[PDB]
Amino acid sequence: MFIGTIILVLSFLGFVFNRRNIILAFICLETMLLGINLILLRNSVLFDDISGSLFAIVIIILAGVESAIGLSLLVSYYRLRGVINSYGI
Amino acid sequence: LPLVLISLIVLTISGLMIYSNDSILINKLLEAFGNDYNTIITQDWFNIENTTLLTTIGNVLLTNNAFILLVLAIVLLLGIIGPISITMKHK
Amino acid sequence: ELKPSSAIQRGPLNKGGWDAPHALHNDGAIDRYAHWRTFYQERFKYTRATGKSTLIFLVAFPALIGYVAYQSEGLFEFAGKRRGESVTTR
Amino acid sequence: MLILAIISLITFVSMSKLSDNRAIIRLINIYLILVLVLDSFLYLLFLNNQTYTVMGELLIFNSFTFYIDMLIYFIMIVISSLYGYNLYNNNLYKTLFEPKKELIILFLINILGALLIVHSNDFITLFVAIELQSYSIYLITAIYNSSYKASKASMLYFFMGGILSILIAYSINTYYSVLNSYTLHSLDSLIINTLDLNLILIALSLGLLFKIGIAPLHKWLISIYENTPILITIYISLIPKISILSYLVLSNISINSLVISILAILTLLVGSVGGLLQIKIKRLLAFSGLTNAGYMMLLLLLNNNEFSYLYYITQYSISHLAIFMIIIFSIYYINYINNQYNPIIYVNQLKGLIHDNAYLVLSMAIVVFSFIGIPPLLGFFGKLNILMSILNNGYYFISIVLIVASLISALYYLYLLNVSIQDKNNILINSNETVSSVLSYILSSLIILITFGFIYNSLIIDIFNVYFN
Amino acid sequence: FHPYNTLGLATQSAMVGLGAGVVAAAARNSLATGPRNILTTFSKSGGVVTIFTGASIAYVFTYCSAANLRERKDGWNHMWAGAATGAVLGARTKLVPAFIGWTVLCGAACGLFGWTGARFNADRKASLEQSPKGFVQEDAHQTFWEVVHRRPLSLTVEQLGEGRGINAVPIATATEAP
Amino acid sequence: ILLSSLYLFNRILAWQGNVKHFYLFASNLLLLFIVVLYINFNTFSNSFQFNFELFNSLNPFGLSNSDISNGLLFGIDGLSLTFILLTVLLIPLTLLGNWYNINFNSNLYYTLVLAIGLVILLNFWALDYISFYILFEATLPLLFILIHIYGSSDSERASFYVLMFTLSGSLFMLLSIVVISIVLNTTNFINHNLFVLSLDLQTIIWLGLFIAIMVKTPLFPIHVWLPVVHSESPLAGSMILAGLILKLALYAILRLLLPLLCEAQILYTPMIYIISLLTIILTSLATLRQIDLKVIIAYSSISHMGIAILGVCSNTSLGIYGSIVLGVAHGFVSPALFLIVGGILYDRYHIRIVNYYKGLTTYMPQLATYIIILSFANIGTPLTGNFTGEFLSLQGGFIRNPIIGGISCISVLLAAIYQLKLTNKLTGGISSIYMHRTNDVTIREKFIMNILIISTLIIGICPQIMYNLLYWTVNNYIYII
Ligand SMILES: CCCCCCCCCCC(CCCCCCCCCC)(CO[C@H]1O[C@@H](CO)[C@H](O[C@@H]2O[C@@H](CO)[C@H](O)[C@@H](O)[C@@H]2O)[C@@H](O)[C@@H]1O)CO[C@H]1O[C@@H](CO)[C@H](O[C@@H]2O[C@@H](CO)[C@H](O)[C@@H](O)[C@@H]2O)[C@@H](O)[C@H]1O
Ligand SMILES: CCCCC/C=C/C/C=C\CCCCCCCC(=O)O[C@H](COC(=O)CCCCCCCCCCCCCCC)COP(=O)([O-])OCC[N+](C)(C)C
Ligand SMILES: CCCCCCCCCCCCCCCCCC(=O)OC[C@H](COP(=O)(O)OCCN)OC(=O)CCCCCCCCCCCCCCCCC
């Protein structure tokens, strides 16, 4: 499924070849999840099957919690150093 | 750029091929671009209720898969307790 | 601020014993010779001579013995053999 | 019992002061023990290998999963003892080992995620459980946030585990797109013959397996293990490995996989050779974990793997706990404390441990020889069962590589004992403070299991024959 | 045994080695430190493309050539192929002891690989788990994994050969008088 | 009893503080007990006699009285009784040979030595492949610790060699034992000659067993660990390693290999003869250029083991009897030579370099006489068990292959050369300038040496005295149609 697949692949490449900042890594994670959900929802429509949409809903909730925890981790990392380097990890 | 190009081609092609069921690899890739046809949308009259996607999701999430909802409640609990644990300094 | 517990009392490690008089008068030259001979494997290198010895004893000699031992297997029987009888079986 | 403990603990800890931490942990410790001894009898349900689907076919309970759950409970009991009980009562040890307010809750939630992974019968259950365990493990890695290394490790964990979680999700959704199903139960011999699922199922296997750090994606997890506080490292290098490996063993989705064969070989080679030049204790133990992961990876290539996997994972868990406990016990005898999160860093700091505590070094010797595989220690019988399994199924080259890796990793296992039995110049005469009775008893029980467990081998096989056949 | 087509199979190997070396060069270029441009990837490759290509040619060509010449398929062909591959890889040392060491030791490791079946996973049908095992029935031929209580003496004479104690007739029976 | 005897041990330790008198007493009782067993051993029967099973599921901590055998089996026939007698003769002497020279942490040292002895003794009782393998490996960590803590200057490298080489061979033996286990679903030695595997599978299983044999014997070309390990070991380690542990390999050939893989063994015998002839000749010649006394003595054992191998693989009754007799005689004489070089000379002078030693006869005539006697015993002078073993082994080897055994007859000369070259310099010439005069041999040292010499002389004059335990054995393993 084209749009989801392209979004996932390009987001993965952006994550991997990121040499600019850490926020790009966070964004690439979020958008890879978006691409996966798009592929899933198209298949859910083509099968007329609720299982795909149920999994997509769960994916959305988990992406929210993962975002919250990832940004908490980033803030805890910031607390000791006061800055994020372009290699900040 | 070299690695980006090789990875682009390989990952895109493989992500289109994982969907096929043909034994031959070239046919696997070819099926990806194989929707030259329109789907025929037809009517029937067996659904008398006004049930939409949201209603059906609620129906399966709260009855068939209630366990998944409760585990998700635990995950949200984690999304509260964890941030507080590492962003707040007690005492 | 991170230090081992003050409660610990460490003394020296003495294995004890009676120091005997030194019955051997060590020769440094002999000791150096013995050290060179004992740890020769640490300095070995593959040259023409050492390689030739390697080829004679680890390759050639085993091959000669093996040819002999597989050619002569079952060939001889000697017990009570008489005149005119063959001592070979093949 | 676990869910109840998590709810009660959140409430109780919320109403408790930071000085109550250890007390609270002690409470939960005894609670877990009680659950293990009063609820054990439920094993009877699985007589003759009866399998139960539960929760509208979301969960699967059998004798294999029941055993894994008991093992995880036992591990949690041992590890929580290390936070609830002080090794010594002096100021330095208060500084070295103090439990955080929320750590016990994070441990219990992570254990829940692991147990749900083990029992997962549907892919939505698997993904929710995997994310529960992953998020918990990130927070556990981060909760000691005064440490620079721990915070950096938590960030690295978050990002690599997120990429691998994405790979797992994509695998599951490709499986759904091919079969309109979310359960492996829909796979039959006819379906496997008819369709090519190999790429999908191996993608799922690799997504799971890179999360416990097999080669060639081993360095990031080894870095995280090195850079966490030691009492965190004991937990985070064991529980995920057990949960993921147990799920893959029970799922049997990679039988006779060429890709898994090659990665298992690479993992054995990398784990054995890459441990050789290590000078830090935790890096050495991490490479040991990598090699033992390769051993267990071999069992994903064959059916009827349950006995050899259960034996190996049990004895390995026991040995891992024992070696970390021994390293913790040796902290009292070292000259130089490197920092408050990792009081001991270098193998050379154990030099002459025999002159300070001889029986600690005897315990170390037993554990090291078990890792090497000397009979009649448990490690020998684990390796023997694995060899029986793989040679029954024709994996000859891999059996030779297994032998070679065992011999190679013996060198870095013997490094610990070697430095530990050398001489040191200033040795201990007396000390007024004794190490804790509770933790010493736990360590001794582990040592005794490693030493004398073989006595029960035939009895164990007899029971296994009636609960797993 | 019908022959391998050494030329075509070896050309295929050439292509695959070149591709794999190109990929390794790209990865090497991305993972390194210091300034790096798009043309330096082969400049700072370390000759990795040549490693891949030369190993591919040596192994596949030698394996096919030895198999065709002996008209057999077994581990010995892989021993020869590994010997040639080790020769290629040890040429990079530029030292005769190291060249010899690579030759013999890679040849031995690949002979060990070929002897086990020349595979990393298993041949499932031939394995003990998928094979007739245990004690054979009445007078059946013994197969690889099967066990008997007595083998036929004719089989022993054929396999071991006559001599040094192996005889077609037991001694006491043959030396009985009438 | 066990409770009471443990109390006895505990109180002795509390009051004396040195465990060694108790260990000497326990080992002497063990020897007496084995002699009592020999008294009640039936010789007109080729069946295992004093059987017991351990760790059965019905009685994990007791003896098995069950109708299903799933524990570890133990029992003895005449062959195993021979080696058990050798073991219980040797153990107290290995305790007594270190009576005075171990001073720091001596309780641990004696515990390690006695444990190694007991493990070997149990190894000779094992009646199945797994019990045999377990007791086979269990000595390695004990030896590692003993050599590492109580060895000479190079003892770290030595401990690592003694662990790693033996583990290396043992793991290929383990492959073979696993294959036997899964193919036959049985592992015991009582009926394993009743199972006839296909010739191909036999040929494969043989390789693993023989790699382990090659490292443990040792044979050329994987022998180079033994001189190092012998040279750096403390005296009890050397005595056990040369007198007992090397005999486990010969026993393994008889017990584990020949009854099960008979046809493959026939097929492989010429390769064995190649390896053994290489061992004999090359190690004998390599001994001529050694400068360490203990290394020279260690190299001697390898050549004698080669002769024993040639005997035991000869497919003749004389060859197998000669191999066993040679094993026993070597177990008498080699520990005596190690006692001389690493117990008497080394405790007086703390050095092993040959250049330092010359003309010991002047101040120590008794030690010189012992050296001469043990040297001529070691090179197979008749009326010594060494001569009987070597002569019968060479007879069997010559029958098995006339050319190979005929060439093997040069070992008489080669052994004479290296041994008498050492003793000539040790006894003759003027007293060395580098060493001061010390005491001649003590009463304890003379006692040990006298025991060993009398044993080798008794079996040298009348080797037939072993036959009542071995006459079934010399027929149990030959394969003739
Ligand atoms: C201590 C040193 C360890 C190293 C030595 C191990 C070497 C293992 C080799 C031996 C062995 C495994 C035996 C395992 C036993 C336990 C394993 C031992 C421990 C393992 C650590 C592998 O045999 C392999 O040999 C290779 C050649 O070298 C072949 O290479 C390849 O060749 C080409 C492909 O066609 C390709 O071109 C290429 O892919 C390679 O070139 C392989 O295909 C072949 O499978 C033999 O097993 C097999 O034997 C055969 C007939 O014997 C059995 O079937 C028989 O059928 C009738 C006749 O057929 C008989 O009438 C019948 O009676 C019997 O039923 C089988 O059932 C099976 O059992
Ligand atoms: C009074 C309540 C106490 C119970 C608390 C148990 C806690 C488990 C904690 C840690 C795990 C340690 C190993 C568990 C033992 C396996 C039992 C079993 O036989 O395992 C079998 C399955 O064998 C296997 O797959 C292989 C297991 C591999 C074991 C490897 C270690 C062997 C050495 C252990 C020596 C035994 C020490 C005894 C000391 C006298 C499952 O047996 P089962 O599922 O029918 O349950 C048993 C009935 N039960 C619930 C009442 C207990
Ligand atoms: C850690 C290494 C691996 C450990 C695995 C193995 C551990 C074994 C532990 C040692 C215990 C074995 C020795 C005790 C068992 C023998 C007890 C016995 O009674 O033997 C039974 C046998 C028949 O007796 P029964 O059928 O009852 O009839 C009697 C009629 N009057 O009666 C007999 O025929 C007598 C049998 C004599 C056997 C001689 C045993 C010599 C050695 C004894 C102590 C060895 C201690 C070794 C310690 C180091 C660990 C190996």
PDB file of C-alpha atoms in Angstrom, chain C residues 46 73-74 77, chain E residues 97 163-165:
ATOM      1  CA  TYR C  46      58.572 -19.623   9.511  1.00  0.00           C
ATOM      2  CA  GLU C  73      47.370 -54.074   5.776  1.00  0.00           C
ATOM      3  CA  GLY C  74      46.497 -57.764   5.941  1.00  0.00           C
ATOM      4  CA  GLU C  77      50.685 -64.095   7.943  1.00  0.00           C
TER       5      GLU C  77
ATOM      6  CA  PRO E  97      53.922 -17.865   5.678  1.00  0.00           C
ATOM      7  CA  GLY E 163      42.572 -60.401   5.745  1.00  0.00           C
ATOM      8  CA  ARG E 164      43.917 -59.694   9.262  1.00  0.00           C
ATOM      9  CA  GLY E 165      41.138 -61.684  10.910  1.00  0.00           C
TER      10      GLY E 165
END
